[PDB]
Recover the amino acids of this structure.
């Protein structure tokens, strides 16, 4: 569509050309053409606009630039709690415009009022009624404009959005890789001409790395990097009698960006964290190839869901005999993922809950997960979460249907997700037909050889040489069937006897246990 | 005037509930059932090269195939992850594992 070309980089705005152009065409176009042809059209000036979205994306800066270039005066600002005697304060905003309309009104200028966090002052019906009367009352103000902002448009009163009054709404959402690139290009201007930065700097890598970053965080990156570098090289040359400009010779900055990025600044939006000690208490010990195989498969899945376009959703299921250590492996993989957003949903936090409450919790977790450009959500003990019981069926149908519907719903455009589940009653799940909802399955077998048992014992380091030889000779046969958790608790129990009567007790406990699937 | 379109995956269960009487007509969407169709789909997706295409055609021209399109996309994406040497081997192994009677 035809438009008058602008110089966005010059105004300092980057990555919002479409929004600026549309706003200017729909809102401020009329008030620039002369009154005569305006009246001949029959055109009627708009009175209000609304902008909503995440915080810090630069809502105010857009109107500030328009005011700078509006060929008029500057805009006045108000705050949500400033007004909150109220009518006296109200008379401090439109009184100037009223005086102008007493002195002018047919050819007068344009006055602009800015409202911050408007939702906090409207949902207190007295102030809402006063404002509604003022914007459109018996008297008509033809030299005023209102631009509200908030972050929760759903909580705004409908009567304020009636078409006669405020009629334009826009959303300003978080930037993308290209948007971050352009924003950095804009912000890296003074140092670009000052040559305070290193030639080895690659802004592309910085833009790629920062996933959940607003413009404010992007600028803080530059601030912290320059501070780090100045301190670094000045302090390096201060403690030595070397030439002062040597420090200035290190003025150029290459690695200080990463240094500041490490822990100086972190994302504000989303970015939940989880504790893994509660789910990995004894660490992870390698007792055979299967652990390596499982870790490799998990890593491959994590890799696929990050550099793929045709599969914006991936799910995986882990299955195995009870106590095989599936939850710990899932938690380890989730921690190794390194995603900005991580969460765990377990039945342990859900004790005595009703079915509807469990459904609400699940949908809330997934709704929060949707908000982040990356995430990873883990669900454990599906069979228990369904409240199964072998004597006939007792599954809560509602909880099953919620899961089955949820597992397929893809997120909005450009957002990715990964889902991992862990189960032990594979056949029951296959009966309910939910197995097909998942994409792949990975097995979690159990120890099935004696040498594996001796290797696990030696890794643990509990039995001495003579006891190790005794156990090895006694159970040299590769006909064992034991899980890591069962082995751990069995050893812990067996250690409680006297030093003499320990190996025999351990052997008796092992014999009591099964030896085949 | 109006037009209603429905979608389902369990036809027999719907048949027992006396539901097909309401619907005026039904259409059947089949799965991939020949090596030629799989080769055409692979060519159109434009992922594998000529030599790997010849190898896949040679190995797959001695068996039957019964697979859904979405599962094929998922398998292709998963197989692409591995290193260039073992891509064909991994894809063929996954196809063999997924292979099942109609
Ligand atoms: N290589 C390992 N694999 C699995 N678990 C390990 C390993 N090394 C140590 N462990 C410990 O073994 C215990 C078993 O882990 P976990 O509690 O997840 O078992 P599980 O089979 O998922 O349990 P549940 O039967 O309750 O579902 C945990 O303490 C874990 O820290
Ligand atoms: N498109 C953009 N161009 C330039 N700066 C931006 C942009 N988006 C965000 N910013 C940054 O955001 C900050 C301003 O945010 P602000 O207008 O205070 O948001 P709000 O008023 O909604 O709190 C500035 O530091 C600015 O550098
Ligand atoms: Mg568990």
């Amino acid at each position: 569509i035809i438009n008058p070309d602008w110089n966005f980089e010059k105004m300092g705005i980057g990555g919002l050309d479409k929004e600026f152009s549309d706003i200017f065409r729909r809102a401020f176009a009329s008030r620039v053409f002369p009154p005569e042809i305006v009246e001949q059209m029959g055109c009627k000036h708009v009175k209000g606009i609304l902008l909503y979205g995440p915080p810090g994306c630069g809502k105010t800066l857009l109107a500030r630039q328009i005011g700078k270039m509006l060929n008029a005066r500057e805009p006045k600002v108000v705050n949500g709690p400033e007004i909150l005697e109220s009518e006296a304060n109200i008379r401090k905003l439109f009184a100037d415009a009223e005086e102008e309309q007493r002195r002018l009104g047919a050819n007068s200028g344009l006055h602009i009022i800015i409202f911050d966090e408007i939702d906090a002052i409207c949902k207190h019906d007295t102030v809402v009624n006063q404002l509604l009367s003022k914007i459109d009352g018996v008297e008509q103000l033809n030299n005023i404009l209102v631009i509200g902002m908030t972050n929760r448009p759903d909580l705004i009163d409908e009567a304020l959005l009636r078409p006669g009054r405020l009629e334009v709404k826009m959303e300003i959402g978080l930037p993308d890789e290209k948007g971050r690139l352009q924003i950095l290009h804009i912000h890296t201007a003074r140092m670009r001409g000052h040559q305070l930065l290193s030639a080895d700097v690659d802004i592309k890598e910085l833009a790629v790395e920062t996933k959940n970053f607003s413009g404010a965080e992007l600028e803080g990156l530059v601030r912290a990097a320059q501070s780090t570098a100045m301190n670094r090289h000045i302090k390096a040359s201060t403690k030595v009698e070397v030439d002062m400009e040597k420090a200035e010779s290190l003025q150029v900055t290459r690695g200080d960006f990463l240094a500041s990025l490490e822990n100086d600044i972190k994302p504000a939006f989303g970015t939940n964290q989880e504790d893994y000690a509660s789910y990995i208490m004894n660490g992870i010990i390698k007792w055979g190839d299967p652990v390596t195989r499982v870790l490799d498969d998990g890593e491959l899945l994590v890799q696929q869901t990050k550099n793929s376009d045709r599969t914006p959703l991936v799910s995986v299921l882990l299955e195995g005999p009870p106590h095989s250590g599936k939850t710990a492996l899932a938690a380890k993989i989730a921690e190794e993922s390194n995603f900005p957003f991580i969460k765990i949903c377990s039945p342990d936090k859900m004790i005595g809950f009703s079915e509807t409450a469990k459904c609400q919790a699940m949908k809330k977790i997934f709704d929060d997960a949707y908000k982040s450009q990356l995430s990873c959500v883990v669900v454990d003990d599906i069979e228990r979460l369904l409240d199964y019981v072998p004597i006939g069926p007792r599954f809560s149908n509602l909880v099953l249907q919620a899961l089955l519907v949820l597992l397929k719903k893809a997120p909005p455009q450009g957002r990715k997700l990964l889902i991992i589940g862990t189960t032990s009653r594979k056949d029951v799940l296959q009966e309910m037909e939910m197995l097909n909802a998942f994409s792949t399955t990975i097995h979690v077998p159990n120890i099935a050889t004696g040498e594996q048992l001796l290797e696990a014992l030696e890794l643990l380091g509990n039995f001495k040489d003579k006891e190790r030889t005794t156990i090895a000779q006694q159970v040299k046969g590769k006909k064992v069937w034991i899980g890591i958790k069962k082995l751990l608790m069995l050893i812990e129990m067996s250690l409680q006897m006297d030093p003499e009567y320990r190996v025999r007790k351990f052997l008796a406990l092992l014999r009591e246990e099964g030896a085949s699937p």
